[model samples]
Target: PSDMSHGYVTVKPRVRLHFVELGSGPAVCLCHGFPESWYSWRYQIPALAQAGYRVLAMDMKGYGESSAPPEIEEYCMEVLCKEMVTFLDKLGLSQAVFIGHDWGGMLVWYMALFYPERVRAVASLNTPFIPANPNMSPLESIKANPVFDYQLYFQEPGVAEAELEQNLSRTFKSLFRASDESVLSMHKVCEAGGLFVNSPEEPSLSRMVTEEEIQFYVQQFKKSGFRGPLNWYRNMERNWKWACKSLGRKILIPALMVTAEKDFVLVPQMSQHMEDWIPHLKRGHIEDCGHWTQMDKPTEVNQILIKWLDSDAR
Candidate 1:
């Protein structure tokens, strides 16, 4: 991951993004999920590059070297979508296929919605395309389900991040799990307490990742803190409002949805009904993978990604 030809570019409003580049061919920009950085795609950077694509993997918004604006309003979907279009302009890229996981996956879909012309295609891991319901606010839905109560806890400004940042490694270790046990579901959040309540202190790292990789994640979070990423959750209703524009529309671009069978948080069943929305969509499933699909099963993930990109040559 060292000496990977990384650099920074500013999207107006003075938002600076740091990205690592590799290989040369069509542009393929990679965005990572929460509690992560550009390093999340460390495996994909070279593989995609080797497969003849110029890979630009960024420390999206607030995770790593990118600017982490303190204000919650700065992290809205529309605002970030506008910033992403500006990113393409600043980097001299007219359009690029976007690949993302978790929170990052949500953004890529918004890219297609906000600026379809700027997104050649989108490939998501774990996170699925959530259609906007005219009547329901996503906040109300999350509040309805106790499993999603952690998001409600996160909504409180300093509480969640403060608990998470106390011990960075523990935060990543607890969330980055391979077992079927659900990590993010804090149904007992109100009953028990904090995000890591009752969990073991000496959580074992998932075998899929090395201690070094965990350290890399720790270092990135150490620099930026958790507020920037948590702010994304703070604007959940705002994001849903922005996505309301796509109410009856469909994503006409080539799209890929990869589901992980073992991902308890963003369960595989959550990926259903994607066909109705994405007419040009292709899907791939990993039998025993977790939320961190890219990290848990990179080879399978890479194969699915490369094969799709190769078959859907544009």
Candidate 2:
């Protein structure tokens, strides 16, 4: 993977994913989050490679080289997990450990519930399962967190759609690097019931993302649009219903959750109540890091991940 031999593999109609498969040993499937592509784990690919586990980092639909369908339903968790199944089948692997971050974290949680046998182990960095409840909208849970207020606006069909679609380039610039101070500042406003207001001023994200990286994302979204990417948020009710139907389904696989001390959307307490639900879980806190735990703290994250994988490798 260091040579980046990874290329595109089509899984569905018009939905092809660019992925890198490297190293040898147990397989581990890595999933990224909303507004992120396979590039999000660029830091981890090499690290895990050195650790001797084959790592497959993929660009989920609507991001990177993956095909982004126009309908919201196409991007829901059920469909997304199916894509993972297809990926493993294509690779001729029966099962592997699953790891995700942010939105990716949510997808893996659902993956374990929906297809428990396919999962060998599970890991998450920031983000936790927002249990489904039809009686209440996701806004209710997110409002209390204020940091996620943008999701409410994104849930709106017409207005939010227009606002985001008007200029995806701008949206990408804003979302690619979540560590921007302005991004952090705007996040606070949502908790207060205020519209997100950030000065148009931009920062140089070049160090974090190169031209190839920027264009790679732009071209993917240009083909897929924001609907596919945004659909994940639209599935709260559907996901809640699913979660309700499968109540008390704890993750039987060895699970690890490492929280970045400075993750804007997640803190140490995010997974506090997980013990009640997850039967096999180990939680850790990474000091001085942010939302992109694996990327922001690759060295430490690598040590943690490899240590666990080494001890448990079958």
Candidate 3:
């Protein structure tokens, strides 16, 4: 219950993961997304810890100090999902309140469907529960849209890793800008050949993180590169099947879905049907917030998160 403690644990033999721990009581596991690490919860960690909860933010296999399984198939959603439970098995915790953002949020949602007994509650920031349909997979869905070319670009394996790892600073600076920073919103960033063909030489910073904090992210990418992380997108086909397996299933656990007003990718509208799927889910929102909801509006996110969790986890 003092300052944040750091350590590593193996999620089975294949994956050894890294995590940050603080304020032990009830364990709250955190998962971050895409270009994120355990540090993604920098603001929320201390706040949640102070609010009478232990926080465990993961480096999540493939990013930061976590072991990245080199085989492309290892990153499939099913395999990645199992690793999380094993992550808990290492801690000897029978259950936990799982929290996530972006891909992490989607993963936790899957966790509820896959193993609700292990999750007491869940809260997702800036992303919603996207139900998977077997008839028409989300894999084929993105192909119909050109704006999602960036994800498709990541589907090419070594190609995207090479491009993203080429100029680490340029990539981070380009992607970490504020919502209002650009005349061009985030939705169409990659259709212009790749994710960064149009970025400035020295892009301006956002309130998202300090220049020093960016260095930590840079150093992380320097070691991990983008190969394992990019492999996540490579398994959308298998991902849909896992999500589709339980078409008759429902997410029965208490859950919360928070949306960013300006998060163009996982727009607030995307959560409209979440209630139909999650019977015990509550909703929260932050105004003028972008994709990085917790960082962009930590105070708002914290208030909503703690308030809900405090009041019977609505």
Number of clashes recorded per candidate: 0, 2, 0
What lDDT does the true structure give each of the candidates? 0.83, 0.72, 0.80
Top candidate by lDDT: 1
RMSD of each: 1.6, 3.2, 2.1
Per-residue lDDT for 211 in model 2?
Answer: 59
- When summed lDDT is taken over every stretch of 10 residues in candidate 3, the lowest stretch is 182-191
TM-score of each: 0.95, 0.86, 0.94
lDDT of 1 by residue, 220-291 (tens): 888779899999888887887777877776777888988998876688888888787766888899998877
Error of 1 at 292 (Å): 0.8
Report how far residue 256 has shifted in candidate 3, in Å.
Answer: 0.4
lDDT of 3 by residue, 1-314 (tens): 12558778887776788899888578888899888888878888888889898889888779988898777898887988898888788889888888889988888888888999889898898878877767886856886755465787677778778878988887777776667763333345446546666567777777677888788789998887998888877888888877778889887878898889987677798788777777688889789998878678879988988897777442
Task: Please identify which of the two predictions, 1 or 2, would achieve the higher lDDT against the true structure.
Answer: 1
Ranking by TM-score: 1, 3, 2
lDDT value for model 3: 0.80
